[PDB]
PDB file of all heavy atoms in Angstrom:
ATOM      1  N   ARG A1035      -9.534  10.901 -28.912  1.00  0.00           N
ATOM      2  CA  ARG A1035      -8.463  11.411 -29.753  1.00  0.00           C
ATOM      3  C   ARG A1035      -7.184  10.627 -29.505  1.00  0.00           C
ATOM      4  O   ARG A1035      -6.815  10.357 -28.361  1.00  0.00           O
ATOM      5  CB  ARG A1035      -8.232  12.894 -29.469  1.00  0.00           C
ATOM      6  CG  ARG A1035      -7.168  13.540 -30.330  1.00  0.00           C
ATOM      7  CD  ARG A1035      -6.795  14.913 -29.811  1.00  0.00           C
ATOM      8  NE  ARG A1035      -5.850  15.587 -30.689  1.00  0.00           N
ATOM      9  CZ  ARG A1035      -4.563  15.294 -30.770  1.00  0.00           C
ATOM     10  NH1 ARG A1035      -4.026  14.334 -30.040  1.00  0.00           N
ATOM     11  NH2 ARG A1035      -3.791  15.980 -31.606  1.00  0.00           N
ATOM     12  N   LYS A1036      -6.505  10.227 -30.583  1.00  0.00           N
ATOM     13  CA  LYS A1036      -5.252   9.469 -30.520  1.00  0.00           C
ATOM     14  C   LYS A1036      -4.136  10.280 -29.886  1.00  0.00           C
ATOM     15  O   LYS A1036      -3.998  11.456 -30.178  1.00  0.00           O
ATOM     16  CB  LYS A1036      -4.908   8.811 -31.866  1.00  0.00           C
ATOM     17  CG  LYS A1036      -4.644   9.772 -33.021  1.00  0.00           C
ATOM     18  CD  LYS A1036      -4.421   9.060 -34.365  1.00  0.00           C
ATOM     19  CE  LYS A1036      -5.700   8.487 -34.985  1.00  0.00           C
ATOM     20  NZ  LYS A1036      -5.464   7.992 -36.369  1.00  0.00           N
ATOM     21  N   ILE A1037      -3.377   9.690 -28.974  1.00  0.00           N
ATOM     22  CA  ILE A1037      -2.312  10.390 -28.271  1.00  0.00           C
ATOM     23  C   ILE A1037      -1.221  10.770 -29.257  1.00  0.00           C
ATOM     24  O   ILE A1037      -0.828   9.973 -30.115  1.00  0.00           O
ATOM     25  CB  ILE A1037      -1.773   9.510 -27.133  1.00  0.00           C
ATOM     26  CG1 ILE A1037      -2.837   9.366 -26.049  1.00  0.00           C
ATOM     27  CG2 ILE A1037      -0.505  10.093 -26.553  1.00  0.00           C
ATOM     28  CD1 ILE A1037      -2.503   8.360 -24.986  1.00  0.00           C
ATOM     29  N   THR A1038      -0.716  11.997 -29.132  1.00  0.00           N
ATOM     30  CA  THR A1038       0.280  12.482 -30.078  1.00  0.00           C
ATOM     31  C   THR A1038       1.530  11.613 -30.054  1.00  0.00           C
ATOM     32  O   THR A1038       2.064  11.250 -31.105  1.00  0.00           O
ATOM     33  CB  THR A1038       0.625  13.937 -29.765  1.00  0.00           C
ATOM     34  OG1 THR A1038      -0.503  14.763 -30.069  1.00  0.00           O
ATOM     35  CG2 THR A1038       1.820  14.407 -30.573  1.00  0.00           C
ATOM     36  N   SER A1039       2.015  11.273 -28.869  1.00  0.00           N
ATOM     37  CA  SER A1039       3.158  10.381 -28.772  1.00  0.00           C
ATOM     38  C   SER A1039       2.717   8.934 -28.960  1.00  0.00           C
ATOM     39  O   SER A1039       1.529   8.608 -28.934  1.00  0.00           O
ATOM     40  CB  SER A1039       3.862  10.548 -27.431  1.00  0.00           C
ATOM     41  OG  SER A1039       4.476  11.816 -27.338  1.00  0.00           O
ATOM     42  N   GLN A1040       3.707   8.081 -29.241  1.00  0.00           N
ATOM     43  CA  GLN A1040       3.428   6.631 -29.392  1.00  0.00           C
ATOM     44  C   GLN A1040       3.756   5.976 -28.052  1.00  0.00           C
ATOM     45  O   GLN A1040       4.727   6.420 -27.405  1.00  0.00           O
ATOM     46  CB  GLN A1040       4.218   6.062 -30.571  1.00  0.00           C
ATOM     47  CG  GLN A1040       3.701   6.538 -31.922  1.00  0.00           C
ATOM     48  CD  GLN A1040       4.265   7.867 -32.360  1.00  0.00           C
ATOM     49  OE1 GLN A1040       5.287   8.330 -31.860  1.00  0.00           O
ATOM     50  NE2 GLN A1040       3.597   8.493 -33.313  1.00  0.00           N
ATOM     51  N   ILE A1041       3.041   4.954 -27.617  1.00  0.00           N
ATOM     52  CA  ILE A1041       3.196   4.396 -26.281  1.00  0.00           C
ATOM     53  C   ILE A1041       3.885   3.056 -26.337  1.00  0.00           C
ATOM     54  O   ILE A1041       3.524   2.203 -27.134  1.00  0.00           O
ATOM     55  CB  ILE A1041       1.829   4.300 -25.608  1.00  0.00           C
ATOM     56  CG1 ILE A1041       0.960   5.576 -25.730  1.00  0.00           C
ATOM     57  CG2 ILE A1041       1.913   3.758 -24.173  1.00  0.00           C
ATOM     58  CD1 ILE A1041       1.534   6.918 -25.309  1.00  0.00           C
ATOM     59  N   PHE A1042       4.886   2.834 -25.493  1.00  0.00           N
ATOM     60  CA  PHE A1042       5.514   1.527 -25.362  1.00  0.00           C
ATOM     61  C   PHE A1042       4.600   0.609 -24.564  1.00  0.00           C
ATOM     62  O   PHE A1042       4.177   0.953 -23.460  1.00  0.00           O
ATOM     63  CB  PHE A1042       6.862   1.670 -24.667  1.00  0.00           C
ATOM     64  CG  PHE A1042       7.693   0.433 -24.692  1.00  0.00           C
ATOM     65  CD1 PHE A1042       8.291   0.006 -25.857  1.00  0.00           C
ATOM     66  CD2 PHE A1042       7.893  -0.298 -23.545  1.00  0.00           C
ATOM     67  CE1 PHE A1042       9.064  -1.126 -25.875  1.00  0.00           C
ATOM     68  CE2 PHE A1042       8.664  -1.429 -23.558  1.00  0.00           C
ATOM     69  CZ  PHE A1042       9.251  -1.845 -24.725  1.00  0.00           C
ATOM     70  N   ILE A1043       4.289  -0.556 -25.127  1.00  0.00           N
ATOM     71  CA  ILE A1043       3.302  -1.450 -24.537  1.00  0.00           C
ATOM     72  C   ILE A1043       3.679  -2.885 -24.872  1.00  0.00           C
ATOM     73  O   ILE A1043       4.221  -3.167 -25.941  1.00  0.00           O
ATOM     74  CB  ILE A1043       1.882  -1.102 -25.031  1.00  0.00           C
ATOM     75  CG1 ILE A1043       0.852  -2.022 -24.388  1.00  0.00           C
ATOM     76  CG2 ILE A1043       1.809  -1.212 -26.532  1.00  0.00           C
ATOM     77  CD1 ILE A1043      -0.571  -1.610 -24.654  1.00  0.00           C
ATOM     78  N   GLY A1044       3.399  -3.793 -23.941  1.00  0.00           N
ATOM     79  CA  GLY A1044       3.633  -5.200 -24.155  1.00  0.00           C
ATOM     80  C   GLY A1044       3.477  -6.018 -22.889  1.00  0.00           C
ATOM     81  O   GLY A1044       3.235  -5.481 -21.804  1.00  0.00           O
ATOM     82  N   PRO A1045       3.598  -7.342 -22.999  1.00  0.00           N
ATOM     83  CA  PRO A1045       3.407  -8.206 -21.825  1.00  0.00           C
ATOM     84  C   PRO A1045       4.657  -8.285 -20.961  1.00  0.00           C
ATOM     85  O   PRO A1045       5.748  -8.573 -21.456  1.00  0.00           O
ATOM     86  CB  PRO A1045       3.076  -9.572 -22.439  1.00  0.00           C
ATOM     87  CG  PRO A1045       2.769  -9.302 -23.866  1.00  0.00           C
ATOM     88  CD  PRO A1045       3.617  -8.138 -24.233  1.00  0.00           C
ATOM     89  N   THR A1046       4.489  -8.050 -19.662  1.00  0.00           N
ATOM     90  CA  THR A1046       5.565  -8.182 -18.693  1.00  0.00           C
ATOM     91  C   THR A1046       5.066  -8.963 -17.487  1.00  0.00           C
ATOM     92  O   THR A1046       3.878  -8.933 -17.162  1.00  0.00           O
ATOM     93  CB  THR A1046       6.086  -6.818 -18.243  1.00  0.00           C
ATOM     94  OG1 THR A1046       6.233  -5.963 -19.378  1.00  0.00           O
ATOM     95  CG2 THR A1046       7.430  -6.957 -17.553  1.00  0.00           C
ATOM     96  N   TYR A1047       5.984  -9.667 -16.834  1.00  0.00           N
ATOM     97  CA  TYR A1047       5.653 -10.516 -15.698  1.00  0.00           C
ATOM     98  C   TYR A1047       5.677  -9.689 -14.422  1.00  0.00           C
ATOM     99  O   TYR A1047       6.733  -9.191 -14.020  1.00  0.00           O
ATOM    100  CB  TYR A1047       6.634 -11.682 -15.597  1.00  0.00           C
ATOM    101  CG  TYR A1047       6.180 -12.773 -14.666  1.00  0.00           C
ATOM    102  CD1 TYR A1047       4.956 -13.389 -14.839  1.00  0.00           C
ATOM    103  CD2 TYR A1047       6.981 -13.199 -13.622  1.00  0.00           C
ATOM    104  CE1 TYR A1047       4.538 -14.384 -13.999  1.00  0.00           C
ATOM    105  CE2 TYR A1047       6.568 -14.195 -12.778  1.00  0.00           C
ATOM    106  CZ  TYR A1047       5.347 -14.785 -12.973  1.00  0.00           C
ATOM    107  OH  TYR A1047       4.926 -15.783 -12.136  1.00  0.00           O
ATOM    108  N   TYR A1048       4.521  -9.512 -13.798  1.00  0.00           N
ATOM    109  CA  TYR A1048       4.408  -8.751 -12.562  1.00  0.00           C
ATOM    110  C   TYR A1048       4.169  -9.693 -11.393  1.00  0.00           C
ATOM    111  O   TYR A1048       3.617 -10.788 -11.539  1.00  0.00           O
ATOM    112  CB  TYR A1048       3.362  -7.630 -12.698  1.00  0.00           C
ATOM    113  CG  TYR A1048       4.000  -6.320 -13.130  1.00  0.00           C
ATOM    114  CD1 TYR A1048       4.702  -6.249 -14.350  1.00  0.00           C
ATOM    115  CD2 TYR A1048       4.004  -5.213 -12.259  1.00  0.00           C
ATOM    116  CE1 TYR A1048       5.452  -5.101 -14.667  1.00  0.00           C
ATOM    117  CE2 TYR A1048       4.727  -4.050 -12.587  1.00  0.00           C
ATOM    118  CZ  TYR A1048       5.467  -4.002 -13.788  1.00  0.00           C
ATOM    119  OH  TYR A1048       6.240  -2.922 -14.082  1.00  0.00           O
ATOM    120  N   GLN A1049       4.619  -9.259 -10.221  1.00  0.00           N
ATOM    121  CA  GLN A1049       4.432  -9.962  -8.963  1.00  0.00           C
ATOM    122  C   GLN A1049       3.618  -9.100  -8.017  1.00  0.00           C
ATOM    123  O   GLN A1049       3.772  -7.878  -7.987  1.00  0.00           O
ATOM    124  CB  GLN A1049       5.775 -10.279  -8.311  1.00  0.00           C
ATOM    125  CG  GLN A1049       6.676 -11.161  -9.131  1.00  0.00           C
ATOM    126  CD  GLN A1049       8.133 -10.953  -8.807  1.00  0.00           C
ATOM    127  OE1 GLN A1049       8.523  -9.910  -8.296  1.00  0.00           O
ATOM    128  NE2 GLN A1049       8.946 -11.954  -9.091  1.00  0.00           N
ATOM    129  N   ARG A1050       2.752  -9.741  -7.241  1.00  0.00           N
ATOM    130  CA  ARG A1050       2.036  -9.074  -6.166  1.00  0.00           C
ATOM    131  C   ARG A1050       2.726  -9.404  -4.854  1.00  0.00           C
ATOM    132  O   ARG A1050       2.816 -10.574  -4.476  1.00  0.00           O
ATOM    133  CB  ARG A1050       0.575  -9.503  -6.114  1.00  0.00           C
ATOM    134  CG  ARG A1050      -0.134  -8.960  -4.904  1.00  0.00           C
ATOM    135  CD  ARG A1050      -1.615  -9.204  -4.939  1.00  0.00           C
ATOM    136  NE  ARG A1050      -2.273  -8.470  -3.865  1.00  0.00           N
ATOM    137  CZ  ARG A1050      -3.571  -8.507  -3.620  1.00  0.00           C
ATOM    138  NH1 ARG A1050      -4.391  -9.251  -4.340  1.00  0.00           N
ATOM    139  NH2 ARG A1050      -4.064  -7.770  -2.629  1.00  0.00           N
ATOM    140  N   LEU A1051       3.215  -8.381  -4.165  1.00  0.00           N
ATOM    141  CA  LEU A1051       3.895  -8.594  -2.904  1.00  0.00           C
ATOM    142  C   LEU A1051       2.881  -8.681  -1.769  1.00  0.00           C
ATOM    143  O   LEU A1051       1.733  -8.252  -1.891  1.00  0.00           O
ATOM    144  CB  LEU A1051       4.897  -7.476  -2.641  1.00  0.00           C
ATOM    145  CG  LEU A1051       5.819  -7.183  -3.819  1.00  0.00           C
ATOM    146  CD1 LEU A1051       6.831  -6.133  -3.444  1.00  0.00           C
ATOM    147  CD2 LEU A1051       6.507  -8.442  -4.281  1.00  0.00           C
ATOM    148  N   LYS A1052       3.323  -9.248  -0.649  1.00  0.00           N
ATOM    149  CA  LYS A1052       2.431  -9.505   0.472  1.00  0.00           C
ATOM    150  C   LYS A1052       2.082  -8.253   1.264  1.00  0.00           C
ATOM    151  O   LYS A1052       1.234  -8.327   2.158  1.00  0.00           O
ATOM    152  CB  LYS A1052       3.053 -10.539   1.409  1.00  0.00           C
ATOM    153  CG  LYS A1052       4.163 -10.016   2.302  1.00  0.00           C
ATOM    154  CD  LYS A1052       4.479 -11.020   3.390  1.00  0.00           C
ATOM    155  CE  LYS A1052       5.672 -10.599   4.224  1.00  0.00           C
ATOM    156  NZ  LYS A1052       5.313  -9.524   5.182  1.00  0.00           N
ATOM    157  N   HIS A1053       2.703  -7.116   0.965  1.00  0.00           N
ATOM    158  CA  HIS A1053       2.491  -5.890   1.736  1.00  0.00           C
ATOM    159  C   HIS A1053       1.202  -5.222   1.277  1.00  0.00           C
ATOM    160  O   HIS A1053       1.199  -4.216   0.566  1.00  0.00           O
ATOM    161  CB  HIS A1053       3.682  -4.961   1.584  1.00  0.00           C
ATOM    162  CG  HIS A1053       4.982  -5.580   1.980  1.00  0.00           C
ATOM    163  ND1 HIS A1053       5.327  -5.802   3.297  1.00  0.00           N
ATOM    164  CD2 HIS A1053       6.023  -6.023   1.239  1.00  0.00           C
ATOM    165  CE1 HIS A1053       6.525  -6.355   3.346  1.00  0.00           C
ATOM    166  NE2 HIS A1053       6.969  -6.499   2.113  1.00  0.00           N
ATOM    167  N   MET A1054       0.083  -5.795   1.695  1.00  0.00           N
ATOM    168  CA  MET A1054      -1.205  -5.175   1.432  1.00  0.00           C
ATOM    169  C   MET A1054      -1.391  -3.953   2.322  1.00  0.00           C
ATOM    170  O   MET A1054      -0.678  -3.757   3.307  1.00  0.00           O
ATOM    171  CB  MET A1054      -2.335  -6.171   1.667  1.00  0.00           C
ATOM    172  CG  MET A1054      -2.748  -6.938   0.429  1.00  0.00           C
ATOM    173  SD  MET A1054      -1.811  -8.458   0.246  1.00  0.00           S
ATOM    174  CE  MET A1054      -2.744  -9.534   1.317  1.00  0.00           C
ATOM    175  N   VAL A1055      -2.361  -3.121   1.961  1.00  0.00           N
ATOM    176  CA  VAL A1055      -2.603  -1.900   2.724  1.00  0.00           C
ATOM    177  C   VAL A1055      -3.541  -2.142   3.898  1.00  0.00           C
ATOM    178  O   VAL A1055      -3.418  -1.477   4.928  1.00  0.00           O
ATOM    179  CB  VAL A1055      -3.152  -0.794   1.813  1.00  0.00           C
ATOM    180  CG1 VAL A1055      -4.526  -1.163   1.291  1.00  0.00           C
ATOM    181  CG2 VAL A1055      -3.213   0.513   2.566  1.00  0.00           C
ATOM    182  N   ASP A1056      -4.473  -3.083   3.775  1.00  0.00           N
ATOM    183  CA  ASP A1056      -5.378  -3.374   4.878  1.00  0.00           C
ATOM    184  C   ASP A1056      -4.664  -3.996   6.062  1.00  0.00           C
ATOM    185  O   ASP A1056      -5.265  -4.118   7.132  1.00  0.00           O
ATOM    186  CB  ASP A1056      -6.495  -4.296   4.413  1.00  0.00           C
ATOM    187  CG  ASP A1056      -7.607  -3.550   3.717  1.00  0.00           C
ATOM    188  OD1 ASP A1056      -7.778  -2.346   3.990  1.00  0.00           O
ATOM    189  OD2 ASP A1056      -8.316  -4.170   2.900  1.00  0.00           O
ATOM    190  N   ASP A1057      -3.409  -4.405   5.896  1.00  0.00           N
ATOM    191  CA  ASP A1057      -2.612  -4.946   6.981  1.00  0.00           C
ATOM    192  C   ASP A1057      -1.697  -3.906   7.608  1.00  0.00           C
ATOM    193  O   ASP A1057      -0.807  -4.270   8.380  1.00  0.00           O
ATOM    194  CB  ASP A1057      -1.782  -6.123   6.474  1.00  0.00           C
ATOM    195  CG  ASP A1057      -2.637  -7.228   5.900  1.00  0.00           C
ATOM    196  OD1 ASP A1057      -3.828  -7.303   6.260  1.00  0.00           O
ATOM    197  OD2 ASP A1057      -2.119  -8.020   5.085  1.00  0.00           O
ATOM    198  N   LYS A1058      -1.879  -2.628   7.281  1.00  0.00           N
ATOM    199  CA  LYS A1058      -0.998  -1.585   7.783  1.00  0.00           C
ATOM    200  C   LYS A1058      -1.765  -0.395   8.349  1.00  0.00           C
ATOM    201  O   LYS A1058      -1.251   0.327   9.205  1.00  0.00           O
ATOM    202  CB  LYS A1058      -0.065  -1.123   6.665  1.00  0.00           C
ATOM    203  CG  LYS A1058       0.938  -2.176   6.252  1.00  0.00           C
ATOM    204  CD  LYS A1058       1.799  -1.705   5.103  1.00  0.00           C
ATOM    205  CE  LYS A1058       2.793  -2.767   4.693  1.00  0.00           C
ATOM    206  NZ  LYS A1058       3.764  -3.069   5.779  1.00  0.00           N
ATOM    207  N   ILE A1059      -2.989  -0.188   7.888  1.00  0.00           N
ATOM    208  CA  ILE A1059      -3.763   0.983   8.281  1.00  0.00           C
ATOM    209  C   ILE A1059      -4.290   0.790   9.695  1.00  0.00           C
ATOM    210  O   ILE A1059      -4.903  -0.237  10.006  1.00  0.00           O
ATOM    211  CB  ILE A1059      -4.915   1.222   7.294  1.00  0.00           C
ATOM    212  CG1 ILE A1059      -5.902   2.253   7.844  1.00  0.00           C
ATOM    213  CG2 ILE A1059      -5.642  -0.083   7.013  1.00  0.00           C
ATOM    214  CD1 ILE A1059      -7.038   2.575   6.905  1.00  0.00           C
ATOM    215  N   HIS A1060      -4.046   1.770  10.562  1.00  0.00           N
ATOM    216  CA  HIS A1060      -4.653   1.757  11.888  1.00  0.00           C
ATOM    217  C   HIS A1060      -4.599   3.157  12.474  1.00  0.00           C
ATOM    218  O   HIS A1060      -3.753   3.972  12.105  1.00  0.00           O
ATOM    219  CB  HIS A1060      -3.959   0.771  12.823  1.00  0.00           C
ATOM    220  CG  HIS A1060      -2.777   1.343  13.536  1.00  0.00           C
ATOM    221  ND1 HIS A1060      -2.800   1.643  14.881  1.00  0.00           N
ATOM    222  CD2 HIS A1060      -1.540   1.673  13.097  1.00  0.00           C
ATOM    223  CE1 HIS A1060      -1.628   2.131  15.240  1.00  0.00           C
ATOM    224  NE2 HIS A1060      -0.842   2.158  14.177  1.00  0.00           N
ATOM    225  N   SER A1061      -5.511   3.419  13.407  1.00  0.00           N
ATOM    226  CA  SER A1061      -5.578   4.687  14.112  1.00  0.00           C
ATOM    227  C   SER A1061      -5.835   4.403  15.586  1.00  0.00           C
ATOM    228  O   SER A1061      -5.981   3.250  15.997  1.00  0.00           O
ATOM    229  CB  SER A1061      -6.662   5.587  13.520  1.00  0.00           C
ATOM    230  OG  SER A1061      -7.931   4.981  13.636  1.00  0.00           O
ATOM    231  N   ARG A1062      -5.892   5.459  16.392  1.00  0.00           N
ATOM    232  CA  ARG A1062      -6.114   5.298  17.820  1.00  0.00           C
ATOM    233  C   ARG A1062      -6.789   6.536  18.388  1.00  0.00           C
ATOM    234  O   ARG A1062      -6.556   7.654  17.927  1.00  0.00           O
ATOM    235  CB  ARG A1062      -4.805   5.037  18.566  1.00  0.00           C
ATOM    236  CG  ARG A1062      -4.986   4.889  20.059  1.00  0.00           C
ATOM    237  CD  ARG A1062      -3.673   4.773  20.780  1.00  0.00           C
ATOM    238  NE  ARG A1062      -3.844   5.022  22.205  1.00  0.00           N
ATOM    239  CZ  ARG A1062      -4.153   4.093  23.096  1.00  0.00           C
ATOM    240  NH1 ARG A1062      -4.330   2.832  22.749  1.00  0.00           N
ATOM    241  NH2 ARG A1062      -4.290   4.440  24.371  1.00  0.00           N
ATOM    242  N   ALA A1063      -7.672   6.411  19.371  1.00  0.00           N
ATOM    243  CA  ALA A1063      -8.238   7.547  20.103  1.00  0.00           C
ATOM    244  C   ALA A1063      -8.647   7.099  21.516  1.00  0.00           C
ATOM    245  O   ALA A1063      -9.755   6.605  21.719  1.00  0.00           O
ATOM    246  CB  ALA A1063      -9.409   8.116  19.293  1.00  0.00           C
ATOM    247  N   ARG A1064      -7.742   7.216  22.500  1.00  0.00           N
ATOM    248  CA  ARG A1064      -7.906   6.676  23.867  1.00  0.00           C
ATOM    249  C   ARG A1064      -8.331   5.203  23.908  1.00  0.00           C
ATOM    250  O   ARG A1064      -9.391   4.852  24.427  1.00  0.00           O
ATOM    251  CB  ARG A1064      -8.852   7.544  24.714  1.00  0.00           C
ATOM    252  CG  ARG A1064      -8.330   8.947  25.027  1.00  0.00           C
ATOM    253  CD  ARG A1064      -9.129   9.553  26.186  1.00  0.00           C
ATOM    254  NE  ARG A1064     -10.573   9.531  25.896  1.00  0.00           N
ATOM    255  CZ  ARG A1064     -11.240  10.448  25.236  1.00  0.00           C
ATOM    256  NH1 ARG A1064     -10.746  11.617  24.991  1.00  0.00           N
ATOM    257  NH2 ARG A1064     -12.437  10.210  24.796  1.00  0.00           N
ATOM    258  N   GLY A1065      -7.496   4.323  23.375  1.00  0.00           N
ATOM    259  CA  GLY A1065      -7.622   2.886  23.616  1.00  0.00           C
ATOM    260  C   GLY A1065      -6.855   2.439  24.873  1.00  0.00           C
ATOM    261  O   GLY A1065      -6.804   3.174  25.856  1.00  0.00           O
ATOM    262  N   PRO A1066      -6.204   1.267  24.857  1.00  0.00           N
ATOM    263  CA  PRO A1066      -5.559   0.658  26.024  1.00  0.00           C
ATOM    264  C   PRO A1066      -4.296   1.399  26.437  1.00  0.00           C
ATOM    265  O   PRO A1066      -3.712   2.170  25.675  1.00  0.00           O
ATOM    266  CB  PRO A1066      -5.239  -0.764  25.556  1.00  0.00           C
ATOM    267  CG  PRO A1066      -5.183  -0.671  24.096  1.00  0.00           C
ATOM    268  CD  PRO A1066      -6.207   0.344  23.711  1.00  0.00           C
ATOM    269  N   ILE A1067      -3.876   1.139  27.674  1.00  0.00           N
ATOM    270  CA  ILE A1067      -2.793   1.866  28.321  1.00  0.00           C
ATOM    271  C   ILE A1067      -1.838   0.855  28.933  1.00  0.00           C
ATOM    272  O   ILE A1067      -2.265  -0.185  29.442  1.00  0.00           O
ATOM    273  CB  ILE A1067      -3.325   2.829  29.404  1.00  0.00           C
ATOM    274  CG1 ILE A1067      -4.256   3.876  28.794  1.00  0.00           C
ATOM    275  CG2 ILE A1067      -2.183   3.523  30.121  1.00  0.00           C
ATOM    276  CD1 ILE A1067      -3.600   4.828  27.818  1.00  0.00           C
ATOM    277  N   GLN A1068      -0.544   1.162  28.892  1.00  0.00           N
ATOM    278  CA  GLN A1068       0.437   0.318  29.550  1.00  0.00           C
ATOM    279  C   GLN A1068       0.201   0.297  31.057  1.00  0.00           C
ATOM    280  O   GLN A1068      -0.630   1.027  31.598  1.00  0.00           O
ATOM    281  CB  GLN A1068       1.853   0.814  29.278  1.00  0.00           C
ATOM    282  CG  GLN A1068       2.397   0.435  27.933  1.00  0.00           C
ATOM    283  CD  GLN A1068       3.868   0.744  27.814  1.00  0.00           C
ATOM    284  OE1 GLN A1068       4.488   1.222  28.762  1.00  0.00           O
ATOM    285  NE2 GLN A1068       4.439   0.473  26.652  1.00  0.00           N
ATOM    286  N   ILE A1069       0.949  -0.568  31.737  1.00  0.00           N
ATOM    287  CA  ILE A1069       0.752  -0.797  33.155  1.00  0.00           C
ATOM    288  C   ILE A1069       1.835  -0.141  34.002  1.00  0.00           C
ATOM    289  O   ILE A1069       1.547   0.286  35.126  1.00  0.00           O
ATOM    290  CB  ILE A1069       0.674  -2.308  33.452  1.00  0.00           C
ATOM    291  CG1 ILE A1069       0.031  -2.563  34.817  1.00  0.00           C
ATOM    292  CG2 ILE A1069       2.056  -2.930  33.414  1.00  0.00           C
ATOM    293  CD1 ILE A1069      -1.352  -1.968  34.969  1.00  0.00           C
ATOM    294  N   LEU A1070       3.081  -0.002  33.537  1.00  0.00           N
ATOM    295  CA  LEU A1070       4.168   0.559  34.346  1.00  0.00           C
ATOM    296  C   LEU A1070       4.143   2.086  34.334  1.00  0.00           C
ATOM    297  O   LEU A1070       3.807   2.711  35.330  1.00  0.00           O
ATOM    298  CB  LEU A1070       5.502  -0.044  33.891  1.00  0.00           C
ATOM    299  CG  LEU A1070       6.745   0.512  34.602  1.00  0.00           C
ATOM    300  CD1 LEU A1070       6.653   0.465  36.118  1.00  0.00           C
ATOM    301  CD2 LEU A1070       7.941  -0.342  34.211  1.00  0.00           C
ATOM    302  N   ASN A1071       4.428   2.688  33.184  1.00  0.00           N
ATOM    303  CA  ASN A1071       4.195   4.095  32.886  1.00  0.00           C
ATOM    304  C   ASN A1071       2.941   4.181  32.028  1.00  0.00           C
ATOM    305  O   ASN A1071       2.841   3.471  31.042  1.00  0.00           O
ATOM    306  CB  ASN A1071       5.418   4.690  32.172  1.00  0.00           C
ATOM    307  CG  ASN A1071       5.885   3.888  30.976  1.00  0.00           C
ATOM    308  OD1 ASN A1071       6.325   2.767  31.082  1.00  0.00           O
ATOM    309  ND2 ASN A1071       5.856   4.446  29.822  1.00  0.00           N
ATOM    310  N   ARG A1072       1.958   4.998  32.397  1.00  0.00           N
ATOM    311  CA  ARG A1072       0.576   4.898  31.898  1.00  0.00           C
ATOM    312  C   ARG A1072       0.372   5.523  30.515  1.00  0.00           C
ATOM    313  O   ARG A1072      -0.506   6.353  30.312  1.00  0.00           O
ATOM    314  CB  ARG A1072      -0.382   5.459  32.959  1.00  0.00           C
ATOM    315  CG  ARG A1072      -0.329   4.643  34.251  1.00  0.00           C
ATOM    316  CD  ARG A1072      -1.286   5.224  35.282  1.00  0.00           C
ATOM    317  NE  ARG A1072      -1.222   4.450  36.532  1.00  0.00           N
ATOM    318  CZ  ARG A1072      -1.657   4.834  37.708  1.00  0.00           C
ATOM    319  NH1 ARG A1072      -2.228   5.988  37.865  1.00  0.00           N
ATOM    320  NH2 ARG A1072      -1.543   4.055  38.735  1.00  0.00           N
TER     321      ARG A1072
END
């Protein structure tokens, strides 16, 4: 079914930034420990 409103559409120049998500996701569950205060 055709949308009741009319949609603004056209070509625009987009950029992909370097902030990917696979470079930010991390978790931890008893990994490594510091040496001075543990």
Side-chain angles (χ1 to χ4, degrees):
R1035 182 192 185 285
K1036 64 185 74 172
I1037 292 171
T1038 291
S1039 292
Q1040 289 85 18
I1041 313 307
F1042 190 72
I1043 181 171
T1046 316
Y1047 194 56
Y1048 267 60
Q1049 299 154 338
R1050 173 172 189 182
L1051 311 184
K1052 76 167 174 76
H1053 303 286
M1054 268 90 83
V1055 66
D1056 278 335
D1057 301 337
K1058 292 177 180 296
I1059 168 178
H1060 87 108
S1061 61
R1062 179 186 163 88
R1064 294 197 305 274
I1067 299 295
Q1068 281 190 1
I1069 198 57
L1070 177 52
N1071 51 295
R1072 297 180 181 163

